[PDB]
Amino acid sequence: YSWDSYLNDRLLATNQVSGAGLASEEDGVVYACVAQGEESDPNFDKWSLFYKEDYDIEVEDENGTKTTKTINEGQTILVVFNEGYAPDGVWLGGTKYQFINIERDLEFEGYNFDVATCAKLKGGLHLVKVPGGNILVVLYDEEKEQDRGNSKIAALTFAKELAESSQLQH
């Protein structure tokens, strides 16, 4: 597909998320995305929310020790599903999110899902493994009448649609 159409009609049309993308499970790199930017900003760059090439960050531990870490953003998404923790945080689009929770085999209306949630200032994201070996990335923005609970139901509802038609395979 051109996944943009689909993401917009099925997910962004809800008004419950600020953005949505698909990542490959192989590298965790978002390859299709939409952002509610629209009003909003018309020269708004949706990719700015979802993609950023490898960069170094400076970290200071409690000791006062300063190190550099090279952030590969996709990898920070894979570590949460692969290991169940985030040694560096989850980074997306240059923004740091805090890993709050992972729920494996969460039951949503007939289907099971691995779903992770991370937080930023006045927002966050949900990550859901969906078929085709994809990760669904959903953003929410508390300044836009969105919240963590409703964006997650919205992410799960979209994942269920994908899981259902993935089972028409003929």
Swiss-Prot record:
Gene3D superfamilies per UniProt: Dynein light chain 2a, cytoplasmic
Any one cellular-component term (Gene Ontology): cell cortex
SUPFAM superfamilies: Profilin (actin-binding protein)
Top-level lineage group: Eukaryota
Positions of the record's site feature: Interaction with actin: 85
Ranges where the record places region Actin-binding: 96-108, 148-152
GO biological process, one term: actin cytoskeleton organization
GO MF: actin monomer binding; phospholipid binding
Site residues (Interaction with Pro-rich sequence), renumbered to this chain: 31
Known partners and oligomeric status: Binds actin.
Name of the featured protein: Profilin
